[PDB]
Amino acid sequence: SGEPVYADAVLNGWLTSMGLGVEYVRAEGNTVYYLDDEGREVPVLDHACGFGSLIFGHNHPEIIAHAKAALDAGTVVHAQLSRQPRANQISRILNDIMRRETGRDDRYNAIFANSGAEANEICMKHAELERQERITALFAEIDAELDTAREALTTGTATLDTASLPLVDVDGVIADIHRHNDERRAERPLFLTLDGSFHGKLVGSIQLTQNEPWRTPFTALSSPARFLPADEPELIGKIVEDERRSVLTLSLDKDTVRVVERDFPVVAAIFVEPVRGGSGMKTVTPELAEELHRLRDTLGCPLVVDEVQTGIGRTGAFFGSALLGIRGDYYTLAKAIGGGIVKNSVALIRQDRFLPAMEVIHSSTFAKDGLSASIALKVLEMVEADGGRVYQRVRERGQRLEAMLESVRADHSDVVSAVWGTGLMLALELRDQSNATSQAIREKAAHGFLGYVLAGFLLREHHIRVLPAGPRSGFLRFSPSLYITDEEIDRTETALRSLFTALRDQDGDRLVL
Amino acid sequence: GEPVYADAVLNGWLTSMGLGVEYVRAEGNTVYYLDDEGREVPVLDHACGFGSLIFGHNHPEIIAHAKAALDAGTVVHAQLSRQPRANQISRILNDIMRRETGRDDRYNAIFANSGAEANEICMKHAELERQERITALFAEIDAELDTAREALTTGTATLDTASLPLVDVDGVIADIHRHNDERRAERPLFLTLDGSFHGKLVGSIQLTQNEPWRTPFTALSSPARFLPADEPELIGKIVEDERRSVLTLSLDKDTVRVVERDFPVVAAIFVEPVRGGSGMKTVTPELAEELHRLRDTLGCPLVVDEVQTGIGRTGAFFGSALLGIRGDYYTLAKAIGGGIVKNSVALIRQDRFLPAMEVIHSSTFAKDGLSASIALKVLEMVEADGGRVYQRVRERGQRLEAMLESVRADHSDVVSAVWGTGLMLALELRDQSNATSQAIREKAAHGFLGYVLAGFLLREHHIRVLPAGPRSGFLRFSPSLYITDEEIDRTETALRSLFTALRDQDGDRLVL
Numbered sequence A: 001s002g003e004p005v006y007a008d009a010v011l012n013g014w015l016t017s018m019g020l021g022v023e024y025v026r027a028e029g030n031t032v033y034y035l036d037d038e039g040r041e042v043p044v045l046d047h048a049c050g051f052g053s054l055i056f057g058h059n060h061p062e063i064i065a066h067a068k069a070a071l072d073a074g075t076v077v078h079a080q081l082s083r084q085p086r087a088n089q090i091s092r093i094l095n096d097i098m099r100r101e102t103g104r105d106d107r108y109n110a111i112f113a114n115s116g117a118e119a120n121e122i123c124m125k126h127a128e129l130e131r132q133e134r135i136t137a138l139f140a141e142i143d144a145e146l147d148t149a150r151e152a153l154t155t156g157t158a159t160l161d162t163a164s165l166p167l168v169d170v171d172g173v174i175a176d177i178h179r180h181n182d183e184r185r186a187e188r189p190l191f192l193t194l195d196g197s198f199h200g201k202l203v204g205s206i207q208l209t210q211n212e213p214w215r216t217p218f219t220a221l222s223s224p225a226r227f228l229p230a231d232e233p234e235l236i237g238k239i240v241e242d243e244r245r246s247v248l249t250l251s252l253d254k255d256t257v258r259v260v261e262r263d264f265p266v267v268a269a270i271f272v273e274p275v276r277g278g279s280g281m282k283t284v285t286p287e288l289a290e291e292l293h294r295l296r297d298t299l300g301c302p303l304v305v306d307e308v309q310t311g312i313g314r315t316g317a318f319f320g321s322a323l324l325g326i327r328g329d330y331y332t333l334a335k336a337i338g339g340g341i342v343k344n345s346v347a348l349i350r351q352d353r354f355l356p357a358m359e360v361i362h363s364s365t366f367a368k369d370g371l372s373a374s375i376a377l378k379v380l381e382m383v384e385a386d387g388g389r390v391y392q393r394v395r396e397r398g399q400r401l402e403a404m405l406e407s408v409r410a411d412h413s414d415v416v417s418a419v420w421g422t423g424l425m426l427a428l429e430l431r432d433q434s435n436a437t438s439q440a441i442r443e444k445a446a447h448g449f450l451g452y453v454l455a456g457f458l459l460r461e462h463h464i465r466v467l468p469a470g471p472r473s474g475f476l477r478f479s480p481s482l483y484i485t486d487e488e489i490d491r492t493e494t495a496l497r498s499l500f501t502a503l504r505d506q507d508g509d510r511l512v513l
Numbered sequence B: 001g002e003p004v005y006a007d008a009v010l011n012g013w014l015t016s017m018g019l020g021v022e023y024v025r026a027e028g029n030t031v032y033y034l035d036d037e038g039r040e041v042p043v044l045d046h047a048c049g050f051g052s053l054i055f056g057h058n059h060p061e062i063i064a065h066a067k068a069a070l071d072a073g074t075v076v077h078a079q080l081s082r083q084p085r086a087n088q089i090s091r092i093l094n095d096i097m098r099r100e101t102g103r104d105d106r107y108n109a110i111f112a113n114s115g116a117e118a119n120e121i122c123m124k125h126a127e128l129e130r131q132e133r134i135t136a137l138f139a140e141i142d143a144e145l146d147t148a149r150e151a152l153t154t155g156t157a158t159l160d161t162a163s164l165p166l167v168d169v170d171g172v173i174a175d176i177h178r179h180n181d182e183r184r185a186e187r188p189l190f191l192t193l194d195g196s197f198h199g200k201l202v203g204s205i206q207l208t209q210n211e212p213w214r215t216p217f218t219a220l221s222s223p224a225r226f227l228p229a230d231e232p233e234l235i236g237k238i239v240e241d242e243r244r245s246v247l248t249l250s251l252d253k254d255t256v257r258v259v260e261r262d263f264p265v266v267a268a269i270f271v272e273p274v275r276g277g278s279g280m281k282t283v284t285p286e287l288a289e290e291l292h293r294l295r296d297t298l299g300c301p302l303v304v305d306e307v308q309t310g311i312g313r314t315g316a317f318f319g320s321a322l323l324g325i326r327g328d329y330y331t332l333a334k335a336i337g338g339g340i341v342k343n344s345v346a347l348i349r350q351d352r353f354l355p356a357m358e359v360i361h362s363s364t365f366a367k368d369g370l371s372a373s374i375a376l377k378v379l380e381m382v383e384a385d386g387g388r389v390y391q392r393v394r395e396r397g398q399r400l401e402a403m404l405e406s407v408r409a410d411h412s413d414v415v416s417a418v419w420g421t422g423l424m425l426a427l428e429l430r431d432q433s434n435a436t437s438q439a440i441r442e443k444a445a446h447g448f449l450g451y452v453l454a455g456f457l458l459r460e461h462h463i464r465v466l467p468a469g470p471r472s473g474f475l476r477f478s479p480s481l482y483i484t485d486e487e488i489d490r491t492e493t494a495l496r497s498l499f500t501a502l503r504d505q506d507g508d509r510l511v512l
């Protein structure tokens, strides 16, 4: 060590002890290259692929060429507050795709951004615009209910029923209700998410992300989420019912005036991933989808469908939600839309709910830039080409890779519990090894580092790049490009059988450095 | 009347301001649109990505480097592997900071995708520090309590009962714990300046003063207190108002007393060296020294936001170094993407930096190889030839400011001030809400004056200016360092024309 270090020291220390301390110098297709002791390029097969950003692989020639052309044409990258038709054009296409895949003829407005978290946060913000609109309306009614009950109570007709007063003379009861209601109005809203949810790591979005050491230090900053148990959905109704909050009004009935509770909108939005990355690639079950629908219908807030990972074809359709029958009101996309080379994202918000203020009170310096716009159109061209046969490829490559994984599970069920996911978004679940015979394995599994250690084995002994997913690296992710070959899938089967035979043997010398 | 899938409202509005144009190509300080007949009309760009284009649109050196990086098969997505370029970029910014401040401090770098993301990394790390302070204080309080309980039970001391307005032993102990836990879970506060603009995401928007942008989202996130930058002698009392204390038991031989102890409510202080949302006002020495006192006093970090002021714009790399602001965290963005890609960075002082952050924060796109490579190029360019790029910025800045000042001197009836430094300048417009012209008065009342004037400049002089400040009350001028004397002259002509029409209250001509 010794010498000054200006970034990544801790991160690199850790990567090294996991066996993952390598620098990749070049990438193409499903292959990334590092330099060995002697200085030649060793090819490594990439199953992580930007955590699912690279449906078309690293540095796809068609995307590279288009990008260089865009650069040579003098594309206007920074043209803020001018007419940028390409944003309308991208949205037209995603709209047409959504209609095709859902049957539904709904229209969405598009707001662009620079990352998944930014796009989800545009959704969070627009959700909260809708709640403020509901809130204003209810408080307007309450005012008129009060004025009415006061004129009945003063002029003569009615008498205040005093048994209602545990909830708080006229003016004093009125002002106490306004005091109560204003306190309630200013309380932060709640967001609903699923357990294992991963929606981004910014100040707002991190609260929507379950992972405990990532989120808990920041609890005090921003509105919280309630993390619904996705596997036991019959439980979700009661948990949301617990969260009801009411405000107060005065209610006239001829001659009796009563203080009464009225429902207050606490919940700003519900968020769901069609396939749940922080949970180990579990797809949302039909039962769960129908509970989310009920919740959205019931509370009158938007269902936000987060397709940062599941979208642009990964699941065997453009939208994973369409595949799995999830009918959201807002949608977000990112990752693969930058083509593997630039940074872009988008929030699609239904036009019958969309509030025009948002188009001019939200904005960003880099958002909607011409270059990533141009690259977005190219990606959508590619994924849609030839009668939508790119999706068919994804399906059949996905089937092939899942069958291999399922075949590996069947012979190694002692260390592998499940295969999860769909299309080319798959994972193996590892059985717990916190109770393991090998000292060195047990200690890593106890630290939540098992998956990373196994990944290091796969790197150094088989030249395959896998990365773990899930809360204690308890899952191994497999999300390669659509061009993944049978030979590469066979090489991965060989590698995995090797890995899980060593893990069966509890061979800690060999697994842990 | 046909289906529309984005930008309908935005485009409606741009059109009525006179700003409804499509640019098809850009190079240097010039953007091009197509006229009725289909030829490229050149427009001089004074907005330049709101200050992102210190080197202009699509600078050949940046374009070429980018295409090379693409041809080389650069690894863009290499998450959780060894990416030396991030350490390299940080080494350089470190060396630059030492050079320009004299200070030999070391900063850790965390990268991101926008200015708001970078500022929010800072927000998050500020709050990690406060949780550490909080844990420590509550640890002491525990031991103060155990001690005061053993004195009170084992003879020596008696509880002085006059202290009890603040809440028998166990009952007083548990009431203190109840009080303290309530206080521990309250959201922190952030301090900013009036007119502050720090980003528009859920967290960052609360740090942004602009009222219609922020107020709808109040309920979501911790608030800021917006300090009055022009009247700093007032800032001490406003922060004092915000003190909150916790309770402990304090032993003095024989008397045990309940007493207050200071609680850290403030997570960070944020400042822009030159304040974009305020119309390009630079932080005065007096204000800087008040921010220093505040940071020393509260023990939270001073976060210096150089998203706009950095990468040379002010005539040094760091605007804070120019203006004598000594922050603990720094953030950069905008010009570091070279005008073509999206990147940002948080520099956090290593003696304050908490190692957990390096592994509990992360982002998909952050630290990508491509914007990394382009970052090194930009830093190479801005540092080249003995740091003469900065000297250029100074001298171009002087020239453009003198023109603006000269325009002010003959048009002081409609122009109050010139603000800013280096190539980050603005004219302040006098209020026109009281204006003679109907059509002008109505736009000024809507907060749209600056946009209307901008439309005049576009259609009658082929110059692109955009307003700044809360009611478009300022006109921004922030072009590349390559801006020419001829272009500056053409802008002087255009401005004299504009402010002569505005003097004339010529609403027919100004408002479409």
Ligand SMILES: Cc1ncc(COP(=O)(O)O)c(CN)c1O
Pocket (backbone or CB within 6 Å): A051, A114, A115, A116, A117, A118, A198, A199, A200, A201, A273, A277, A306, A307, A308, A309, A310, A334, A335, B363, B364, B365
């Ligand atoms: C499903 C999902 N949603 C949101 C995000 C956040 O996206 P980004 O990293 O671009 O901010 C991610 C990235 N992990 C994601 O995988």
Ligand SMILES: Cc1ncc(COP(=O)(O)O)c(CN)c1O
Pocket (backbone or CB within 6 Å): A363, A364, A365, A366, B114, B115, B116, B117, B119, B197, B198, B199, B200, B272, B276, B305, B306, B307, B308, B333, B334
């Ligand atoms: C000083 C400052 N800080 C933060 C931001 C936000 O940066 P971005 O738009 O890339 O999120 C801006 C851009 N208005 C800025 O000028």
